[PDB]
Design a protein around this ligand. Structure first.
Ligand SMILES: Nc1nc2c(ncn2[C@@H]2O[C@@H]3COP(=O)(O)O[C@H]4[C@@H](O)[C@H](n5cnc6c(=O)[nH]c(N)nc65)O[C@@H]4COP(=O)(O)O[C@H]3[C@H]2O)c(=O)[nH]1
Lengths: 173, 177
C-alpha cells in the first residue's frame, strides 16, 4: 500500500457494513425482530416472539473489555437469564443476525453486542510483535488500547461519512 | 513496523486472522468436539428451519472450501446467488459462540461431499480501498483491480501462515473464481 492501516481499521469497516448497517436497514424495512424464548438441545429456536420495532429505535450498545484477551470468554459470561437472544432475518444474508437484548417485562431497554471481530486485533498484535517486546514496559496494553480506540474512531468516521445519525453507543469496561 | 508504534498492516491481514480464529478454527473444534451438523431441509414463509436432519461428522472431516470471486465488489451479491437447491444450508451449534455457525453443503444423496463459504469479511478489504483512495487514483492505471488482487492473495497467504503456526490440518482449500 501507500497508506498506513492499523489492524482494527478494516475490522471496523467490516463490523459497520456487514453487521451494524445491516441491522439498521433491517430495522428501517422489517420494523420487527424475533425473540428466542425456548430452545431445544441442538440450540434450535422452538418458541419465538415477533416484536415490532419503533422509530424510537433501541440503542445498539457496543461493549468492549479493555482486557481484549478475555473477549472470547466475555461473550459466553454475559449470557444470563436477564438478557434474551434476538435475531433479525435480513435480505442481506442467508442466515439471520443474532444479538443480545435487555427486556423489562414486554419492553426492549437496549440491544448490546461484544464485537468478536475486535479480538482479531489482539491476535494480529500477538503475531506481529515478539512476546519479549509485548511484556516490556507495558507495551502490549498500550497497543491493545490504541487498537480499541482506533476501532471506535473508525466507526465514528464511518457514521459521519455516511451522513448517518448515530445509532450506537461505544463503552469500554 | 517494529521497535516503535508506527506499525502498518494490509487491510486483509487482520480480516484473515479474524476469519481463521473466529470462524474456521471454531468449525474445526466443533468437529473435533464431536458436535454434529444440522441440515435444513424445510423452511417456513418467514425462513425458519422446519425440518432439520442431524449428520454425524467422521474423522475424515469434509474439506471447508473457501470460494472468492475475483470481482470482490460483487461478493455481497454472490453470497445470495449460490443459495440454490443443489446446495443445502447447514449449521453447527459450537460451544465457542451463543449463536450457531451457518454454512452451505454439497450432498450426493445423503453423503456430505464438501462444506463451502464465501468470505463476507473479505468485502471489508474492497470497502477499505474504496474509502482510503481517491476515485481518480482507482480509475487511473487499473489500480483498483491490482489492489483487490493483492488483497485476495494476502488473505489466502495470511490463512496459510496461521495454520502453519498451529496445526496443518489443511481442513480448507482456497479457490478464486
Ligand atoms: N453478534 C453478532 N455479530 C455479528 C454477526 N454477524 C457479524 N457479526 C460481527 O461482525 C463481524 C464481521 O462479520 P463478517 O464481515 O460477516 O465476517 C465474518 C464472516 O466472514 C465469517 N463468519 C463468522 N461467523 C460466520 C457464520 O456463522 N457463518 C459464515 N458463513 N461466516 C461466518 O467470519 C468473519 C469474522 O467473524 P467475527 O470475527 O465474529 O466478526 C464479525 C462479528 O464481529 C451476527 O449475526 N451477530
Amino acid at each position: 500500500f501507500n497508506y498506513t492501516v492499523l489492524p482494527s481499521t478494516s475490522l471496523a469497516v467490516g463490523y459497520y457494513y456487514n453487521f451494524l448497517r445491516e441491522i439498521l436497514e433491517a430495522f428501517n424495512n422489517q420494523k420487527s425482530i424475533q425473540i428466542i424464548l425456548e430452545r431445544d438441545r441442538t440450540g434450535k429456536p422452538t418458541k419465538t416472539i415477533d416484536y415490532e420495532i419503533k422509530k424510537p429505535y433501541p440503542t445498539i450498545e457496543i461493549r468492549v473489555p479493555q482486557n481484549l484477551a478475555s473477549l472470547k470468554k466475555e461473550v459466553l459470561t454475559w449470557n444470563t437469564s436477564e438478557y434474551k437472544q434476538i435475531f433479525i432475518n435480513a435480505a442481506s444474508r442467508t442466515y439471520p443476525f443474532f444479538l443480545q437484548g435487555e427486556f423489562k417485562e414486554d419492553q426492549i431497554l437496549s440491544i448490546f453486542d461484544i464485537p468478536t471481530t475486535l479480538y482479531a486485533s489482539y491476535l494480529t498484535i500477538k503475531e506481529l510483535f515478539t512476546d519479549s517486546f509485548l511484556k516490556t514496559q507495558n507495551n502490549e496494553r498500550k497497543l491493545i488500547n490504541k487498537e480499541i480506540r482506533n476501532f471506535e474512531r473508525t466507526l465514528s468516521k464511518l457514521i459521519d461519512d455516511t451522513i448517518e445519525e448515530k445509532f450506537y453507543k461505544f463503552t469500554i469496561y
